[PDB]
Structure 1
Amino acid sequence: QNLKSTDRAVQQMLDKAKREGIQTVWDRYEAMKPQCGFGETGLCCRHCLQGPCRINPFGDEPKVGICGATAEVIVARGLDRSIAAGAAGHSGHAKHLAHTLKKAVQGKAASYMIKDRTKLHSIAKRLGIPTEGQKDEDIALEVAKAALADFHEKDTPVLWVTTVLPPSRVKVLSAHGLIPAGIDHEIAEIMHRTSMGCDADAQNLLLGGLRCSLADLAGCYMGTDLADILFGTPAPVVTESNLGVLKADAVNVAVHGHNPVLSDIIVSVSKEMENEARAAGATGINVVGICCTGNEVLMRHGIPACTHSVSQEMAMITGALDAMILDYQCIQPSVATIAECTGTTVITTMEMSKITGATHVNFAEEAAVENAKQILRLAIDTFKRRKGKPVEIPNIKTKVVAGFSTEAIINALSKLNANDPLKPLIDNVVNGNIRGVCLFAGCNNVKVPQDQNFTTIARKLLKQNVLVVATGCGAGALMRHGFMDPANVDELCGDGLKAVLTAIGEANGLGGPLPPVLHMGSCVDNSRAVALVAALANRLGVDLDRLPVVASAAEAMHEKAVAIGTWAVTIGLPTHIGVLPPITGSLPVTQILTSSVKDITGGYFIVELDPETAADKLLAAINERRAGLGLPW
């Protein structure tokens, strides 16, 4: 089972699933092998009814698509559609939150409100919306309106790009025609250009992809901004992770998906319903997180994280998961069927994301509390039904310190330098105590033993004094393996990094360090890393492609992760991907994405499946940046 997951709790549940005959994602993977090599390499097209077309990577015919599409074109079109799909997900989540905010401040949904007034005003100032003499509800309405306006063409480009990067970066991107005109506009233009008999020049196609990846960035940044207004900007919080956060004697309710608009209300209403759960024989309602909706409520409220991506089914296998409350994205639809075996009540809530066999609740903001109580009552009923049934919850959990928004990082640093908070971080980059910064982002992927790349690469980087930050299932991996527990700083961190984490931690009164890795939140909250890195670039008076900052989507899976990797490259970062995207069928496309794009944006992909090698390549990238700033390395 160690060949499937490096998480011991997952291994334990994989043994239980096997003896019970419950098929898992890893079983379904095994049943799929050998996988199609045309698709793996990107040399397949189904963009018209003359296909499917394929191209042999090597050898004889077929060499070209039926319409004449080359390997270059086919690979680039496929990639562009994945970027557009990722942009559609992040920006759909953001759009939904914009509508929520509008409802809140129009008095249409009293369960929602402006929680973070400081965030609201800062965003309005970033955007150039006046605040002086305006009511908060009106400033919010303006913010929501501006968010919605970034989805279509208008007299300005997408402000959730141009107002979040430094002018010198915007100027480089503008020069190459890369600034998006509108989020849904770009998504549609990708779908058009990639359709049969349209764009058929790899460079042109890939420039379009880069632009659409910035539309994805805008969606991410918008989603973080709006969720912080509605639900609060995260600050440091202490919690736990892994399956051992489940409790046999409680009603265990997982919140799973990405948009926390209802799950944030579930957290608050569950508390209210404690005496009702006790009436049903439970100690209370124990809300736990899966995936990014889990990350959202972890970051804001300290809700413990149960599990992430690839291992999500394992929470059900314990027998103790009374309900799984779903929004959208990254939910294996197997959960609906596994529920028949495990007894879990799986509940969908969003109109555009249903799963055959799951019970659907028509969530509406105006009815959010009513919805939450209905859902929680189903969970309580489910808990009652498992009266007397043994459960098998692995007694495995880690301590997690999280909540490191960019605001929180800047505040923590300000305890070392109140009026120039970034300076202590830069001072330590310069003196070598911090070698650089690495963002771990993205998924787990069944192809890679769960967490192995994230932990292998992080361990090497941390020993080499890299400041590591993480989001999404990268954060999930690292938290489940102890990288968010400050007790592990001595073991994991190089001396320079330890000194910095300790100095910041002791200035924040902790009597001890920051954790080894800073959890910056959900997948949209990759935008928080952009804010930090843009702030550093502006403080130094350089562009992002001069900073010793890299990214690693070490176990990438979703189209969303491909979009994030692509905008990381576009904003100027060396960006590792630890699974093969479907590009290797075209050497020219590979050479653009790994090499010639450096000349355009300064960033580039590093495609490397061996994690020890990837760590060495990431360090080399960091060190090349240091050398370009004239620093020792």
Structure 2
Amino acid sequence: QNLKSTDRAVQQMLDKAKREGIQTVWDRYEAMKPQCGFGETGLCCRHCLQGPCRINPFGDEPKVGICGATAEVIVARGLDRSIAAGAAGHSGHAKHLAHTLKKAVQGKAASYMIKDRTKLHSIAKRLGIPTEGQKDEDIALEVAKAALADFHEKDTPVLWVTTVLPPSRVKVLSAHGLIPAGIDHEIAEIMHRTSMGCDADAQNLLLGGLRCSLADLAGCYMGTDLADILFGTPAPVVTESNLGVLKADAVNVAVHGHNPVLSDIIVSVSKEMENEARAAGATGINVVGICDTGNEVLMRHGIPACTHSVSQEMAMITGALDAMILDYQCIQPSVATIAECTGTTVITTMEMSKITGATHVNFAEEAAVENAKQILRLAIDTFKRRKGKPVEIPNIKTKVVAGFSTEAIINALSKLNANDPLKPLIDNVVNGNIRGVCLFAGCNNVKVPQDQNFTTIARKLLKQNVLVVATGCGAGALMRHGFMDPANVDELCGDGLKAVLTAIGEANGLGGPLPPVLHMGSCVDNSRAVALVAALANRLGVDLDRLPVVASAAEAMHEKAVAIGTWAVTIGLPTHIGVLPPITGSLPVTQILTSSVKDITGGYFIVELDPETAADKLLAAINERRAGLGLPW
């Protein structure tokens, strides 16, 4: 089982699933091997009904698509569509929060409100919305309207790109025609240009892809901004992770998916219904997180994280998961089938994200609290049905310190320098105590033993004094293996990094260091890392492609992860991906994405499936940036 997952709680549940004859994601993977090499290399096209077309990576015919589409066109078009689909997911998330804020401040959804006025005003100021002498609800209405306006063409470009990056970077991107005109506009234009008989030049196609990836960045940043207004900007928090946070005697309710509009209300209402759960025989309601909705409520409320990503079915296999409340994205639809075996009540809530065999509850912002109670009562009913059923919850959990929004990091740093809080970080980059910064992002992937790349790479970087930040299931992987427990600083961190984490931690009244890895939140909260990196660039007077900052999507899976990787490259970062994207069938496209794009944006992809090799390559990328600044390394 350790070839499937390095998580020991997951290994225990894989044995239980095998005993009980419950098919898992890993079983369905094994049943799929060997996978189609045309698809794995990207040399397959189904963009019209003359297909499917494929191209042999090597050898004889077929060499070209039926319409004349070359390998480099086919690969570029497929990649572009994956970027657009990722952008659409982050677009939809942000759009649904923008409508939630608009409803809140127009008096249409009283369960929602402006919880962070400070953030609201700073966003309004960044966008040029006047605040002085205005009511909050009117400022927020203007912010929500500006968010919705970024989805379409208007007299300005996408402001959640142009107002969040340094002017020098916007200038570079503008010179190459890469600034998005509208978020959904770019998604549609990708789908158009990649349809049959349209764009057929790899470089032109890929520039469109870079531009659409910035539409994805805008959706991420908009999503974080609006979620923080509505639900609070995260601050440091301490909780736990892994399956051991389930409690046999409680109603265990997992929030799963991505959008907190739903999950954040569940958290509040669950506290109300504690007595009603005790009436049913439970100790209370135990809300736990799966995937990124779980990260959202972990970051804001300290809700413990149950599991992530590839191992999500394992929470159910314990027998103790009474409900799984879903919104959208990264939900294995197998959960609806597995629930028949495990007793779990799987509940969908979004009109455009239903699963055959799952109970659907039509959530509406206008009735959020009512819907939450309907949902939690189904969960209580399910708990009662397992009175006296044995469960097997692995007694495995880790301590997780998290909540490191960029505002939190700046505040923590300000304890070392009150009016120049970035300077202490830059000082230690310059003197070598911090070699650089690495953002771990993205998913787990059944092709990679779960968490293996994240932890292998992270260990090597931390020993080399790299400051490591993480989001999404990269944060999930690191938290479930102790990387967010400050007790592990001595073991994991080089001396210089330990010194820095210790100084900051002690200066914030903690008696101990910051954790080895800083949890910056969900996948949309990769935007928080952008905010931090752009602020560092501005403080140093350079563009992002001169900073010793890298990213690693070490076990990427979702189209969203491809979009995030592509905009990391586009804003100037060396960007590792630890799974093969479907590009290796075209050497010209691979060359553009791993080399020549350097001369456009300064970033570049690092495709490397061996994690020890990937870490050496990330260190070389960091150290090249150090040398470019004239620093020792």
TM-score norm. by structure 2 comes to: 1.00
Query: CA separation in 2, counterparts of 1:552 and 1:418?
Result: 32
| Deviation digits for residues 331-390 of structure 1 (CA, Å, limit 9, x no counterpart) | 000000000000000000000000000000000011000000000000000000000000
- Equivalent in the alignment of 1:625: 625
| Deviation digits for residues 456-479 of structure 1 (CA, Å, limit 9, x no counterpart) | 000000000000000000000000
- Partner-residue secondary structure (3-state), 2:419: coil
| Deviation digits for residues 209-254 of structure 1 (CA, Å, limit 9, x no counterpart) | 0000000000000000000000000000000000000000000000
Instruction: Please state how far the C-alpha of 1:625 moved relative to its aligned partner.
Output: 0.1
Query: CA separation in 1, counterparts of 2:229 and 2:54?
Result: 48
- Partner-residue secondary structure (3-state), 1:588: helix
Instruction: Please state how far the C-alpha of 1:491 moved relative to its aligned partner.
Output: 0.2
Query: CA separation in 2, counterparts of 1:171 and 1:600?
Result: 12
Query: CA separation in 2, counterparts of 1:365 and 1:611?
Result: 44
| Deviation digits for residues 169-203 of structure 1 (CA, Å, limit 9, x no counterpart) | 00000000000000000000000000000000000
Query: CA separation in 1, counterparts of 2:177 and 2:207?
Result: 8
- Equivalent in the alignment of 1:594: 594
| Deviation digits for residues 47-98 of structure 1 (CA, Å, limit 9, x no counterpart) | 0000000000000000000000000000000000000000000010000000
Query: CA separation in 1, counterparts of 2:16 and 2:194?
Result: 45
- Equivalent in the alignment of 1:126: 126
Query: CA separation in 2, counterparts of 1:620 and 1:186?
Result: 34
Instruction: Please state how far the C-alpha of 1:313 moved relative to its aligned partner.
Output: 0.1
Instruction: Please state how far the C-alpha of 1:262 moved relative to its aligned partner.
Output: 1.1
Query: CA separation in 1, counterparts of 2:277 and 2:388?
Result: 16
- Partner-residue secondary structure (3-state), 1:113: coil
- Partner-residue secondary structure (3-state), 2:215: helix
Query: CA separation in 1, counterparts of 2:168 and 2:56?
Result: 43
- Partner-residue secondary structure (3-state), 1:32: coil
- Partner-residue secondary structure (3-state), 2:29: helix
Query: CA separation in 1, counterparts of 2:595 and 2:303?
Result: 42
Instruction: Please state how far the C-alpha of 1:492 moved relative to its aligned partner.
Output: 0.3
Q: Which runs of 4+ in 1 moved over 6 A?
A: none
Query: CA separation in 2, counterparts of 1:187 and 1:541?
Result: 33
| Deviation digits for residues 245-286 of structure 1 (CA, Å, limit 9, x no counterpart) | 000000000000000101100000000111110000000000
Query: CA separation in 2, counterparts of 1:365 and 1:4?
Result: 40
Instruction: Please state how far the C-alpha of 1:101 moved relative to its aligned partner.
Output: 0.1
State the percentage of identical aligned residues: 100
- Partner-residue secondary structure (3-state), 2:254: strand
Instruction: Please state how far the C-alpha of 1:535 moved relative to its aligned partner.
Output: 0.1
Query: CA separation in 2, counterparts of 1:118 and 1:499?
Result: 32
Query: CA separation in 2, counterparts of 1:118 and 1:613?
Result: 44
| Deviation digits for residues 570-607 of structure 1 (CA, Å, limit 9, x no counterpart) | 00000000000000000000000000000000000000
| Deviation digits for residues 124-170 of structure 1 (CA, Å, limit 9, x no counterpart) | 00001000010000000000000000000000000000000000000
Query: CA separation in 2, counterparts of 1:479 and 1:424?
Result: 26
- Equivalent in the alignment of 1:411: 411
Query: CA separation in 1, counterparts of 2:259 and 2:65?
Result: 40
Instruction: Please state how far the C-alpha of 1:511 moved relative to its aligned partner.
Output: 0.4
- Equivalent in the alignment of 2:264: 264
- Partner-residue secondary structure (3-state), 2:449: coil
- Partner-residue secondary structure (3-state), 1:66: coil
- Partner-residue secondary structure (3-state), 1:439: strand
- Partner-residue secondary structure (3-state), 2:437: strand
- Equivalent in the alignment of 1:306: 306
| Deviation digits for residues 9-38 of structure 1 (CA, Å, limit 9, x no counterpart) | 000000000010000000000000000000
- Partner-residue secondary structure (3-state), 1:374: helix
Query: CA separation in 1, counterparts of 2:14 and 2:71?
Result: 40
- Partner-residue secondary structure (3-state), 1:509: coil
- Partner-residue secondary structure (3-state), 2:261: coil
Instruction: Please state how far the C-alpha of 1:558 moved relative to its aligned partner.
Output: 0.1
Query: CA separation in 2, counterparts of 1:97 and 1:540?
Result: 34
- Partner-residue secondary structure (3-state), 2:401: strand
| Deviation digits for residues 596-626 of structure 1 (CA, Å, limit 9, x no counterpart) | 0000000000000000000000000000000
* Count of aligned pairs: 633
Query: CA separation in 1, counterparts of 2:262 and 2:627?
Result: 48
- Partner-residue secondary structure (3-state), 2:31: helix
Instruction: Please state how far the C-alpha of 1:308 moved relative to its aligned partner.
Output: 0.1
Structure 2: gaps spanning 5 or more residues: none
Query: CA separation in 2, counterparts of 1:183 and 1:464?
Result: 39
Query: CA separation in 2, counterparts of 1:78 and 1:444?
Result: 22
Query: CA separation in 1, counterparts of 2:619 and 2:184?
Result: 37
- Equivalent in the alignment of 1:364: 364
Query: CA separation in 2, counterparts of 1:135 and 1:250?
Result: 43
Query: CA separation in 2, counterparts of 1:197 and 1:272?
Result: 58
- Partner-residue secondary structure (3-state), 1:261: helix
- Equivalent in the alignment of 2:57: 57
Instruction: Please state how far the C-alpha of 1:432 moved relative to its aligned partner.
Output: 0.2
Query: CA separation in 1, counterparts of 2:262 and 2:140?
Result: 20
Query: CA separation in 2, counterparts of 1:431 and 1:536?
Result: 16
TM-score norm. by structure 1 comes to: 1.00
Query: CA separation in 1, counterparts of 2:604 and 2:336?
Result: 39
Instruction: Please state how far the C-alpha of 1:559 moved relative to its aligned partner.
Output: 0.1
Query: CA separation in 2, counterparts of 1:432 and 1:345?
Result: 52
- Partner-residue secondary structure (3-state), 2:347: strand
Query: CA separation in 2, counterparts of 1:548 and 1:148?
Result: 34
Query: CA separation in 1, counterparts of 2:218 and 2:131?
Result: 23
Query: CA separation in 1, counterparts of 2:358 and 2:216?
Result: 30
Instruction: Please state how far the C-alpha of 1:518 moved relative to its aligned partner.
Output: 0.1
Please give the root-mean-square deviation of Cα atoms over the aligned residues, in Å. 0.2
| Deviation digits for residues 454-512 of structure 1 (CA, Å, limit 9, x no counterpart) | 00000000000000000000000000000000000000000000000000000001001
Query: CA separation in 1, counterparts of 2:262 and 2:512?
Result: 36
Query: CA separation in 1, counterparts of 2:174 and 2:266?
Result: 43
Instruction: Please state how far the C-alpha of 1:109 moved relative to its aligned partner.
Output: 0.5
Query: CA separation in 2, counterparts of 1:506 and 1:402?
Result: 16
Query: CA separation in 1, counterparts of 2:510 and 2:436?
Result: 24
- Partner-residue secondary structure (3-state), 1:40: helix
| Deviation digits for residues 527-570 of structure 1 (CA, Å, limit 9, x no counterpart) | 00000000000000000000000000000000000000000000
| Deviation digits for residues 390-428 of structure 1 (CA, Å, limit 9, x no counterpart) | 000000000000000000000000000000000000000
- Equivalent in the alignment of 2:398: 398
- Is 1:183 equivalent to 2:153 in the alignment? no
